[PDB]
């Protein structure tokens, strides 16, 4: 047992309070770098010329932001998709003016979260578990890739990547709607069905299981003490739960099989969110939501507006106002 | 949705934010719980399709809470250990979220909005170089209101001549 | 054509309205398209010199076919709706167009993604099958039960 | 910036009063026998 062997044993050890693992050897430092740079930038970074028009935008707390308005600001449009590490800049001052922190943070974060997914696989294998938790995690991760990498690639600039802040996220969303009509895109619609549905089924499962807990406590103690960690018996009456749910709808919309039930609980939001991610990632190449602008015409040829056309008027508001000093030519082709 | 953004600045409202957290957190719990149970299952049959190896009237848990707890403790740092708490929490998060969003909307009935940050406005009004994502979004909202109101509120008989429409360069 | 001196036209931001410098000095097109200065194409390259776009070539050497092509491409940009309404999202119905590049790019992104998912699926499953626990944890020999407590 | 002058005490008491309520409850729980 030489040093390398012991090192591998420790890295892959099932006894560490936090599993490290080989994916973890990459995850830990990249995530630390991303986090540290993020906290420092969010607190203290000077304003950033996001749209490359020498119009710097302030994102940090010390430069006039609160928690809701603050952001780490996307890198400059003059950079586009160019790689802009610290050492490409003439100075840290330059680097900061141009949104270098954003690139450092999102690249380290994407690497790190990818490795986080890998790591879920890895620990599942060390523990003798089935492997697919990480597949569930691929859905939010794919979403992050969509807004931080794929959409910038499609539009040709990281300046259009989602900003790392609350109001910045809203900005991203509104401009996205202006340019892609994402609300009328079926993949975003499936995404909504996935998170609305996820929420619904969350409450549903929660309340049914809660509602059929077997009596193990008195009135003056929490029902939760009725369950002991590691106990072999199920803590609730799944037959009662099923009976309730089947009478509520009809007998057959209900899941009597807990494995199928829990699989459905995993699958609905995971697939929905996969499609949300694919929505952003294809609208990245400007295949946009449905366009029914002036779709209904009368016998003479007058336009009969539908709600689609009102949506179009709102989108127009967003379009004409966004990045008010950035366009010189009539069409916003990216 | 778009109306509420343009007129109410509804995305800025902390009640809507709590709503969003309850809904997305609900979806998260749904997904993660489902996946966790499905990946800590006991082998209770010989089939490679594991669904058949469950019996409604069985007394035994069909998955290992202990192995699930170790896994999430090592991956994320913390883990459920109480199944009853887990499921109550799954009730609690999206239900609480929706309730908060309802409170925000009740505020909006009265135009009692989270529309602005007054400090931001005082600074921006005095200082034409001060810009944040918040003021950028207000410009988007102003666009929405002006360009959408004539057709969306026909009873007002709005006529907005071209010259008064807010627009950035070129667009 | 209308008489503008495009080399010297200052745009509203202070950057050139038509022409500006890339971050390493090259003369490139102004406006948002500043992000796309890496672009190369046979219709534009004759206007290019050692330092980028050449003001003299621009003033004197732009041919009709170049104008034609620029106009054609500008009006066949790869933007369009799922029901094939050409242009930006706010455009009215009139043109039936979605670029082949959008169709091919989007289709193959979706396919590539789902195939990444398939890779994780069958990789994890193959690992667990070769190790012998793809059908679940053995109740009589649950590995975690023979490991020391985390705390 | 010209912030609301009561924002500070509001935020401080918002944190402290319920946090303290919980700390009291927790500590008196730990000190109970068994």
């Amino acid at each position: 047992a030489n040093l390398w062997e012991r090192f591998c044993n420790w890295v892959t050890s099932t006894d560490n309070r936090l599993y490290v693992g080989w994916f973890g050897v990459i995850m830990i430092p990249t995530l630390l770098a991303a986090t540290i740079c993020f906290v420092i930038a969010f607190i203290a970074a000077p304003p950033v010329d996001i749209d490359g028009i020498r119009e710097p935008v302030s994102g940090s707390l010390l430069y006039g932001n609160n928690i809701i308005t603050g952001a780490v600001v996307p890198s400059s449009n003059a950079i586009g998709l160019h790689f802009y590490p610290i050492w490409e800049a003439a100075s840290l001052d330059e680097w900061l003016y141009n949104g270098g922190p954003y690139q450092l943070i999102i690249f380290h974060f994407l690497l790190g979260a990818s490795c986080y997914m890998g790591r879920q696989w890895e620990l599942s294998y060390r523990l003798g578990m089935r492997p697919w938790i990480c597949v569930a995690y691929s859905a939010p991760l794919a979403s992050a890739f969509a807004v931080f990498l794929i959409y910038p690639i499609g539009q040709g600039s990281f300046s259009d990547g989602m900003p790392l802040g609350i109001s910045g996220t809203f900005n991203f969303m509104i401009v996205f709607q202006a340019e892609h009509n994402i609300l009328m895109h079926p993949f975003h619609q499936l995404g909504v069905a996935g998170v609305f549905g996820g929420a619904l089924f969350c409450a549903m499962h929660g309340s049914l299981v809660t509602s059929s807990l077997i009596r193990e406590t008195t009135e003056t103690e929490s029902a939760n003490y009725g369950y002991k960690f590691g106990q072999e018996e199920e803590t609730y009456n799944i037959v009662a739960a099923h009976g309730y749910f089947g009478r509520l709808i009809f007998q057959y919309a209900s899941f009597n099989n807990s494995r199928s039930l829990h699989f459905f609980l995993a699958a609905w939001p995971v697939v929905g969110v996969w499609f949300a991610a694919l929505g952003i990632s294809t609208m990245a190449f400007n295949l946009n939501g449905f366009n029914f602008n002036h779709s209904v015409i009368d016998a003479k040829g007058n336009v009969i507006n539908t709600w689609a056309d009102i949506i179009n008027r709102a989108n127009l508001g967003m379009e004409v106002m966004h990045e008010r000093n950035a366009h010189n030519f009539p069409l916003d082709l990216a | 949705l778009l109306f509420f953004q343009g007129f109410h600045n509804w995305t800025l409202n902390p009640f809507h934010m709590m709503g969003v957290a309850g809904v997305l957190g609900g979806a998260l719990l749904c997904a993660i719980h489902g996946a966790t149970v499905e990946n800590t299952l006991f082998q209770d049959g010989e089939g490679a399709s594991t669904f058949r190896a469950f019996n409604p009237t069985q007394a035994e848990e069909t998955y290992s809470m202990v192995t699930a707890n170790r896994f999430w403790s090592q991956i994320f740092g913390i883990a459920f250990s109480n199944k009853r708490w887990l499921h109550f929490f799954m009730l609690f998060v999206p239900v609480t979220g929706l309730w908060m969003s309802a409170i925000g909307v009740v505020g909006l009935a009265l135009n009692l909005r989270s529309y602005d940050f007054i400090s931001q406005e005082i600074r921006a009004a005095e200082d034409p170089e001060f810009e944040t994502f918040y003021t950028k979004n207000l410009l988007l909202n102003e666009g929405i209101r002006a360009w959408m109101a004539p057709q969306d509120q026909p009873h007002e008989n709005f006529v907005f001549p071209e010259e008064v429409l807010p627009r950035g360069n070129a667009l | 054509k209308l008489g503008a001196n495009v080399g010297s036209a200052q745009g509203p931001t202070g950057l050139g309205k038509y022409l500006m410098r890339s971050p390493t000095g090259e003369i490139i097109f102004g406006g948002e398209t500043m992000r796309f200065w890496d672009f190369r194409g046979p219709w534009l390259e004759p206007l290019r010199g050692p330092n980028g776009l050449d003001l003299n070539k621009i003033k004197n050497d732009i041919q009709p076919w170049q104008e034609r092509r620029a106009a054609e491409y500008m009006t066949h940009a790869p933007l369009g709706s799922l029901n094939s309404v050409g242009g930006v999202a706010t455009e009215i119905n009139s043109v039936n167009f979605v670029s082949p590049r959008s169709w091919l790019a989007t289709s193959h992104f979706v396919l590539a993604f789902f195939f990444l998912v398939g890779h994780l699926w069958h990789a994890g499953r193959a690992r667990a099958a070769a190790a012998g626990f793809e059908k679940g944890i053995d109740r009589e020999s649950e590995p975690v039960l023979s490991m020391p407590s985390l705390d | 910036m010209e912030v609301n002058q009561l924002g500070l005490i509001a935020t401080a008491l918002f944190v402290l009063v319920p946090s303290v309520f919980l700390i009291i409850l927790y500590v008196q729980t730990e000190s109970q026998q068994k």
Partner: peptide, 30 residues
């Protein structure tokens, strides 16, 4: 003082992460 408040609250949240992870009540099997 606003900045100090935001950063204070954040810092407390991180501290809480530390205690909730490393000083949790240990799960025990019955």
């Amino acid at each position: 003082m606003e900045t100090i408040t935001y950063v204070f609250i954040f810092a407390c949240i991180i501290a809480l992460f530390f205690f909730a992870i490393f000083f949790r009540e240990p799960p025990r099997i019955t």
